[PDB]
Amino acid sequence: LGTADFLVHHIHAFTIHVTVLILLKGVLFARSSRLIPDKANLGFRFPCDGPGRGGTCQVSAWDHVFLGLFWMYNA
Amino acid sequence: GFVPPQLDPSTPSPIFGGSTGGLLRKAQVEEFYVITWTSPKEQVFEMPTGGAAIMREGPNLLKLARKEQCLALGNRLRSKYKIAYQFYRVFPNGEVQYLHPKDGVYPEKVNAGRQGVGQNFRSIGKNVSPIEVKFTGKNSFD
Amino acid sequence: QAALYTHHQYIAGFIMTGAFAHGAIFFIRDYNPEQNEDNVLARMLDHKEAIISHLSWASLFLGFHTLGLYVHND
Amino acid sequence: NLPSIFVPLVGLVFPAIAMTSLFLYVQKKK
Amino acid sequence: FVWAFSLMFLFSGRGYWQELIESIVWAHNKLKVAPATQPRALSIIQGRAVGVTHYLLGGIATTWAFFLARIIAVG
Amino acid sequence: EVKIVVDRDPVKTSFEEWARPGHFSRTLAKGPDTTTWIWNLHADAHDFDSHTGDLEEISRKVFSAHFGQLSIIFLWLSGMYFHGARFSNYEAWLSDPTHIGPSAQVVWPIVGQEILNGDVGGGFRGIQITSGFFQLWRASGI
Amino acid sequence: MSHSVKIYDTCIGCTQCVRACPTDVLEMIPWDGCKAKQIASAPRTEDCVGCKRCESACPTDFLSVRVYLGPETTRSMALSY
Amino acid sequence: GDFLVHHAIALGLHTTTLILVKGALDARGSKLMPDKKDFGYSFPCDGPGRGGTCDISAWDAFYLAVFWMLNTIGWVTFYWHWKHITLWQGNVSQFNESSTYLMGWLRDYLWLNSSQLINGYNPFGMNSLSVWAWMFLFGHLVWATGFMFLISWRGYWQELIETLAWAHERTPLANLIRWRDKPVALSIVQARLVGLAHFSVGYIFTYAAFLIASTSGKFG
Amino acid sequence: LFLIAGHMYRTNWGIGHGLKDILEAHKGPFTGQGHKGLYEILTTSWHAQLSLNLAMLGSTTIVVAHHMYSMPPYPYLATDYGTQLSLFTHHMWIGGFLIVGAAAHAAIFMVRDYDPTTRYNDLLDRVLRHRDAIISHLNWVCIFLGFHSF
Amino acid sequence: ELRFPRFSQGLAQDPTTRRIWFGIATAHDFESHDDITEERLYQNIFASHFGQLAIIFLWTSGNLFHVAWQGNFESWIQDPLHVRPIAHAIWDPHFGQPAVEAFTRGGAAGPVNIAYSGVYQWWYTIGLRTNEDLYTGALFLLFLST
Amino acid sequence: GEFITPGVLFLYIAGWIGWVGRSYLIAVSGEKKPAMREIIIDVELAARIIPRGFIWPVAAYRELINGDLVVDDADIGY
Amino acid sequence: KPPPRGPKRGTKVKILRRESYWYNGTGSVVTVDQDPNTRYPVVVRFAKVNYAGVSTNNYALDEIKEVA
Amino acid sequence: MRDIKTYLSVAPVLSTLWFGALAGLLIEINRLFPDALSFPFF
Numbered sequence A: 001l002g003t004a005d006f007l008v009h010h011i012h013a014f015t016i017h018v019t020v021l022i023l024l025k026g027v028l029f030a031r032s033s034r035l036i037p038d039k040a041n042l043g044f045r046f047p048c049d050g051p052g053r054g055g056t057c058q059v060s061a062w063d064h065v066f067l068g069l070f071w072m073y074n075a
Numbered sequence B: 001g002f003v004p005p006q007l008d009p010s011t012p013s014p015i016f017g018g019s020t021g022g023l024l025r026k027a028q029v030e031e032f033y034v035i036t037w038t039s040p041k042e043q044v045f046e047m048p049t050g051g052a053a054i055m056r057e058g059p060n061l062l063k064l065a066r067k068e069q070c071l072a073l074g075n076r077l078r079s080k081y082k083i084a085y086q087f088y089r090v091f092p093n094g095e096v097q098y099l100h101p102k103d104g105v106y107p108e109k110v111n112a113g114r115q116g117v118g119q120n121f122r123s124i125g126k127n128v129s130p131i132e133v134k135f136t137g138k139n140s141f142d
Numbered sequence C: 001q002a003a004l005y006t007h008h009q010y011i012a013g014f015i016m017t018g019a020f021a022h023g024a025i026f027f028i029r030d031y032n033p034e035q036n037e038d039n040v041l042a043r044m045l046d047h048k049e050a051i052i053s054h055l056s057w058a059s060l061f062l063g064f065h066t067l068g069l070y071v072h073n074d
Numbered sequence D: 001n002l003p004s005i006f007v008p009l010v011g012l013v014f015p016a017i018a019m020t021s022l023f024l025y026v027q028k029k030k
Numbered sequence E: 001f002v003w004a005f006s007l008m009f010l011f012s013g014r015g016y017w018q019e020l021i022e023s024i025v026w027a028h029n030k031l032k033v034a035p036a037t038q039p040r041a042l043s044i045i046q047g048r049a050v051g052v053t054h055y056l057l058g059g060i061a062t063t064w065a066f067f068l069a070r071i072i073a074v075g
Numbered sequence F: 001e002v003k004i005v006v007d008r009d010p011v012k013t014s015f016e017e018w019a020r021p022g023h024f025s026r027t028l029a030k031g032p033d034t035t036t037w038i039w040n041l042h043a044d045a046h047d048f049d050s051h052t053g054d055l056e057e058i059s060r061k062v063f064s065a066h067f068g069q070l071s072i073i074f075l076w077l078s079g080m081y082f083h084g085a086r087f088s089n090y091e092a093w094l095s096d097p098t099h100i101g102p103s104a105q106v107v108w109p110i111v112g113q114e115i116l117n118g119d120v121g122g123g124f125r126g127i128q129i130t131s132g133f134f135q136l137w138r139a140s141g142i
Numbered sequence G: 001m002s003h004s005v006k007i008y009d010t011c012i013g014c015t016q017c018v019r020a021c022p023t024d025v026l027e028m029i030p031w032d033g034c035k036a037k038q039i040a041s042a043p044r045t046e047d048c049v050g051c052k053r054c055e056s057a058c059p060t061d062f063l064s065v066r067v068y069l070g071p072e073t074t075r076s077m078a079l080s081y
Numbered sequence H: 001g002d003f004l005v006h007h008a009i010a011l012g013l014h015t016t017t018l019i020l021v022k023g024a025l026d027a028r029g030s031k032l033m034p035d036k037k038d039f040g041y042s043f044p045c046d047g048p049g050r051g052g053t054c055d056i057s058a059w060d061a062f063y064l065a066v067f068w069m070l071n072t073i074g075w076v077t078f079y080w081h082w083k084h085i086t087l088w089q090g091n092v093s094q095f096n097e098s099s100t101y102l103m104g105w106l107r108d109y110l111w112l113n114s115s116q117l118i119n120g121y122n123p124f125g126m127n128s129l130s131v132w133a134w135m136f137l138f139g140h141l142v143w144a145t146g147f148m149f150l151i152s153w154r155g156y157w158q159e160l161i162e163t164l165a166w167a168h169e170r171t172p173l174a175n176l177i178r179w180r181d182k183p184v185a186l187s188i189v190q191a192r193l194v195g196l197a198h199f200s201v202g203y204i205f206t207y208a209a210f211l212i213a214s215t216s217g218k219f220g
Numbered sequence I: 001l002f003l004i005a006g007h008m009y010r011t012n013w014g015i016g017h018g019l020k021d022i023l024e025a026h027k028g029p030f031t032g033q034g035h036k037g038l039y040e041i042l043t044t045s046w047h048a049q050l051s052l053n054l055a056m057l058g059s060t061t062i063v064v065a066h067h068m069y070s071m072p073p074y075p076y077l078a079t080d081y082g083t084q085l086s087l088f089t090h091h092m093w094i095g096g097f098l099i100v101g102a103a104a105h106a107a108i109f110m111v112r113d114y115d116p117t118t119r120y121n122d123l124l125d126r127v128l129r130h131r132d133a134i135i136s137h138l139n140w141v142c143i144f145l146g147f148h149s150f
Numbered sequence J: 001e002l003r004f005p006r007f008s009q010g011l012a013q014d015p016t017t018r019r020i021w022f023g024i025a026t027a028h029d030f031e032s033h034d035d036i037t038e039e040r041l042y043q044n045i046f047a048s049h050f051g052q053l054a055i056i057f058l059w060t061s062g063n064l065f066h067v068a069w070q071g072n073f074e075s076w077i078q079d080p081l082h083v084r085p086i087a088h089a090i091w092d093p094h095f096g097q098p099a100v101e102a103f104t105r106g107g108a109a110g111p112v113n114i115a116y117s118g119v120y121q122w123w124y125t126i127g128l129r130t131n132e133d134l135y136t137g138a139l140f141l142l143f144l145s146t
Numbered sequence K: 001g002e003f004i005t006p007g008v009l010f011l012y013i014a015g016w017i018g019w020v021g022r023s024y025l026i027a028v029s030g031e032k033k034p035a036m037r038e039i040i041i042d043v044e045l046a047a048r049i050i051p052r053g054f055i056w057p058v059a060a061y062r063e064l065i066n067g068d069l070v071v072d073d074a075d076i077g078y
Numbered sequence L: 001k002p003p004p005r006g007p008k009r010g011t012k013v014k015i016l017r018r019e020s021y022w023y024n025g026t027g028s029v030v031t032v033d034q035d036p037n038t039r040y041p042v043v044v045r046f047a048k049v050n051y052a053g054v055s056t057n058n059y060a061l062d063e064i065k066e067v068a
Numbered sequence M: 001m002r003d004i005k006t007y008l009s010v011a012p013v014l015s016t017l018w019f020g021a022l023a024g025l026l027i028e029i030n031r032l033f034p035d036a037l038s039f040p041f042f
């Protein structure tokens, strides 16, 4: 285990953390957030809440796991 | 016209441990909202900013930073617990403005005497094409 | 040679996309459906279904077989 | 000789004055 | 091919594919072959779901063929 | 206490629902409005939670469903043991495991695809496997 | 006026848009041009966030409440900070 | 070989035209939204109702079009380079046989001709070709950043900023600095435009590096 | 070891533990009511159990792949380079997916089954109340590692 | 108005950072500018065009200036098939030593870039023959830009 | 026999698939809900129609002349 | 004394509203409102469904062509 | 008995039965007339 192994072990620590970030954000904010205060009422997998308030594409918890898959595929 | 609004007093807020979803610097500069409701029984509900706090008997009061939040709770209270509620807007200087029912009656049903601001009396297909409004302050819908 | 021929094709690819792009802005902002009554321009808005579908057919026919013969060759 | 002066000026100074000039103009208020 | 295929679903949106479907549907009205289960474009959260699924399938399989053929030949 | 109270004949074994697609859901059962219908049929097939509102039925469905998942695995295992017996150089592999590739799949020669039958050695041919069953069957003394 | 909300004469007075405004823009006023004898009205367009759900619940030929997105303000952008 | 490629070229022109021509004629309106003219050339969408209306503006028709332009011009310049790069070496048989099956294009053109480029710098030394080797990867990096804006849409990032704009408002020594203009995530159309800018830039720089290095490496 | 561990939880006779009482003694100062009430919300919701099981079975599959390449358990598996690479690669992918599944079903539980009027839990409450801190701090680290790894 | 952008009031009062991004993309769209009139619409375009010609002439005066100050143009003529045309010189203070050697080519004295735009042949054909033709070629185009 | 002969062989088949499918959709068009008879195909009705594609060139060419292969301006709904 | 206006019932009608989903289509009249002030009286039922799933809406007298 | 036939008539079940028959037919023809690059009868 020399230097070249030290870097790559800190790559894995990076992609694991990012993957945790996406999924963890989805779980916590699956019911409400400062953007949408009643996200729970919209269900588990809904596309968006329209283009208002700047644009709310992909706020459903299903779309957080949808994003996680790539990083899982990346890690 | 019998529309004297409610004229917000200073009452006691619900028990809550406090969370990170409360007001921010926007409150100190622009505006923040309060929503005063009266309960008959001390129960537990869920806050719009996540987490659960327990309403106490009688006149409550609670401040939230937007209008979508005051109403989002406002639907829950009126629906789950069959309970009345208003909300206001509070300015930095201190002037407080009456907001929600705006007449004493929820906007769902009809009061003889409100205005008709924002209506076109023609079908939607009859709007004017964008060449007819060019170089003017008008729009097709306006 | 390579740096020149490749250069001008990519320029031509971009410019040709702009031509249609400002075609669309024409139909939105400046077109007038009265002053162009039944002329050759308003008719191209009148059988837009016939234009669109056949373009879809020619693309589909080329796609299936150019790829088709290719996988077979592979 | 001359490159050693003109390369930094267009690479370091001329960007800095440019960014700081725009930043005031963008963030003005009247 | 499957990996590059998934991009058509992730990048683009539904409202374009719905309209192109309409013009295709018109030609079938002309020849009386318009179906009675009306054609529709995929729902918003399905365009994503198909998009991620292919992307994962193309990415994983490419490594699959990359690994087995390489290692089997060298040992 | 802890006992085994079950029911007797909750749902009658019959073929009717096999010819009423989308019977499980009240929304899907009315019929194919558009092609959006034939996608929602599979998206909500297994979501037992959305079909009914009580825990008892959801339980019995997941409990029985697992049996299906358990059954397929056994069928998957059965093929692997069968294939290793009828179409493999396993017994040859037990002689020189160091330098004879494990092969347990043999393709029919239709369109030239018999080129896939590789010279895995051991007087045999076929797709060289890599799931490593052979080391598992040797470690169990087959 | 931040966004412009317009209600046409096709509206059948079903009170499905008003009940679906999450920030209390639209409201119901009397009319005489429908069997229900009431038509919707939008007298508080300032707080209109732009969430088109207000007109994903208007069940008419094309639509009877329409939303045009204009400039954005600090409340029409739904900023909490 | 030249027969099959030409149809691939021909496929590009129709499909590229189809998107643009479909965009132009439906700009004024269509069944999904028969008053599209009242919103302008470029608007984000029209909301989730009626089944969802993502990517409906005639702008977006131009948007999807560019992807097929870069692919199409990709298939043209590819063809010109390989046919000539075999000619200049006097090895014209190599194109005339490998150019009928796809692995021929991937093995004998991409993989084979990039041997000198990727050695622009290795743990043994560097060469003149190093700058083109660097730009080559730099092309891959911008291109791969493009996906980030096309796939991940706005509503996710907006919720991410709000937490961040809370953390900054409570950190001591760092609540003394206040943004003049509030921070928000890019708009829906902006992300598409930004996402396409990366994709195009990375797609030009990548090929432009391979085109020059591989040819100039042999100068023949 | 397993067999003895089987004889812990009380079923019908006098001996054995109560899973409810184990969760109702660990409550701490920082945590408040502690693990009280978790017995219900882990018993009247399948999406809780499926999310919790998926993470553990997901993680275990990965540890399987780290051990089977370093302590080769079957004979003539070491010198089978075709097998070692495949078996290590296979269970990593299986382990990766199942963990992602644990996020989805945990998310589904928050939307459908969670309810703070009956199935009230305190820890799952406190975790919700300071969620802005959790994501922002995890956001900073993901940036820190991003700059110092890539 | 009241701040950047001066040409769009709706953007100006946007408090978020959206204003800055959108104050750059909608700069040249003269129709959607506030208070535009059909006389202004053309007169801006006409002035803007002359701006685009200034760039084109200044751009081409750059090429002539470097090719005749740091280039091989007089030498390249002497044997077109064995002298790499030179685009310009490299002065990058991050370069280490083995790079300085590597990028020294074309018969120069320091690092250079080999010109692949094919200007060297075009100016050979159309009659240019020394450096000095190029310098006046630079000045003239610079004047035309002015 | 390299292209033209195999080509005509295809075009015969392709219409047969095309012409039969058209007949079925028209056949079930006049029912209470044509939706149900396409996701659950009527096998018997598709059996008395499966051979009518043997003579599609003859049948269609008469439709074209008689002007029932196409419609004119009644497109959506009916 | 004045007879009911518009089509009576069941009479197929060709839709003429330009922005409708069933333009140049045909539906069935289910009832016509006899109030003169009513601004869109003829209640037309269809066989297909618009993108919202709806399959009926009111219409104006001059946007209805009574095919027979 | 009626319900079984109806189920067997739903679209997916026909598809595998129809395509399966089609696959068998083409495989047989290629087994009897292999390589088949031209149609040398007329």
Ligand code: CLA
Residues within 6 Å of the ligand: A018, A021, A022, A067, A070, A071, H141, H144, H145, H146, H147, H148, H151, H152, I139, I142, I143, I144, I145, I146, I147, I150
């Ligand atoms: C190659 C493509 C690419 C790249 C570079 C990134 C980069 C990033 N993504 Mg990402 N993403 C991508 C594709 C990519 N993504 C795709 C395709 C998807 C769809 C699945 C996503 C989905 C996604 C999500 C959902 C999330 C991210 C996140 C992140 C960030 C976390 C990493 C970090 O902080 O590192 C720091 C930045 C880098 C390592 C980039 C390279 C910087 C180098 C070291 C130096 C750069 C030059 C330097 C500044 C000098 C400046 C020069 C001067 C002239 C200006 C980072 C900005 C996460 C995030 O932002 O939260 C933390 C997050 O939550 N992305």
Ligand code: CLA
Residues within 6 Å of the ligand: C053, C054, C056, C057, C060, E023, E024, E027, E028, E031, E033, K017, K018, K019, K020, K021, K022, K024, K041, K046
């Ligand atoms: C009876 C079936 C049938 C018939 C007669 C037609 C006829 C037509 N279609 Mg088509 N189409 C069909 C089914 C059919 N379609 C289905 C099921 C799909 C979905 C994949 C499409 C998708 C489609 C597209 C995308 C396009 C057409 C187009 C066209 C027109 C030109 C012909 C063409 O390009 O073929 C296209 C052929 C295909 C796409 C191949 C798929 C068709 C399948 C294989 C046939 C299905 C037959 C049916 C299942 C058998 C029923 C048997 C019954 C006894 C149960 C023509 C009017 C094009 C057009 O507008 O040109 C004017 C065009 O762009 N169609």
Ligand SMILES: CC1=C(/C=C/C(C)=C/C=C/C(C)=C/C=C/C=C(C)/C=C/C=C(C)/C=C/C2=C(C)CCCC2(C)C)C(C)(C)CCC1
Residues within 6 Å of the ligand: C019, C020, C022, C023, C024, C026, H024
């Ligand atoms: C054979 C030959 C010849 C002839 C040739 C020719 C004659 C060609 C032609 C060609 C052509 C003829 C081409 C064309 C092309 C076209 C195009 C390319 C188009 C474009 C278009 C556009 C772009 C459009 C646009 C628009 C829109 C979109 C809408 C409206 C508006 C506008 C108009 C703008 C000769 C004898 C001489 C010689 C020998 C050879």
Ligand SMILES: CC1=C(/C=C/C(C)=C/C=C/C(C)=C\C=C\C=C(C)\C=C\C=C(C)\C=C\C2=C(C)CCCC2(C)C)C(C)(C)CCC1
Residues within 6 Å of the ligand: E031, K014, K015, K016, K018, K019, K022, K056, K060
């Ligand atoms: C001779 C030849 C050739 C040429 C060709 C051509 C040039 C062609 C053209 C063609 C064309 C130009 C065509 C057109 C067409 C049009 C139309 C218009 C059509 C139509 C059709 C239809 C309409 C049909 C229908 C149907 C039927 C009858 C069957 C199926 C079903 C359906 C219903 C679909 C080549 C060189 C290749 C080679 C040699 C041979």
Ligand SMILES: CC1=C(C/C=C(\C)CCC[C@H](C)CCC[C@H](C)CCCC(C)C)C(=O)c2ccccc2C1=O
Residues within 6 Å of the ligand: E008, E009, E010, E012, E013, E014, E017, E018, E040, E041, E042, E043, E044, E046, E047, E048
């Ligand atoms: C291409 C594309 C489509 C078009 C794709 C569609 C409409 C579905 C693909 C067609 C399928 C394959 C239907 C064909 C199968 C039918 C059951 C007919 C079967 C007959 C066969 C046996 C021949 C979308 O609907 C869409 C929606 C949202 C985001 C992106 C996209 C998107 O990118």
Ligand code: SF4
Residues within 6 Å of the ligand: A047, A048, A049, A050, A051, A052, A055, A056, A057, A058, E044, H044, H045, H046, H047, H048, H052, H053, H054, H055, H188
């Ligand atoms: S673009 Fe975004 S806002 Fe618009 S409908 Fe699609 S997902 Fe929703």
Ligand code: SF4
Residues within 6 Å of the ligand: A052, G005, G020, G021, G022, G023, G024, G025, G026, G047, G048, G049, G050, G051, G052, G053, G054, G055, G067
């Ligand atoms: S967009 Fe939202 S805020 Fe505006 S009117 Fe509609 S529902 Fe109300």
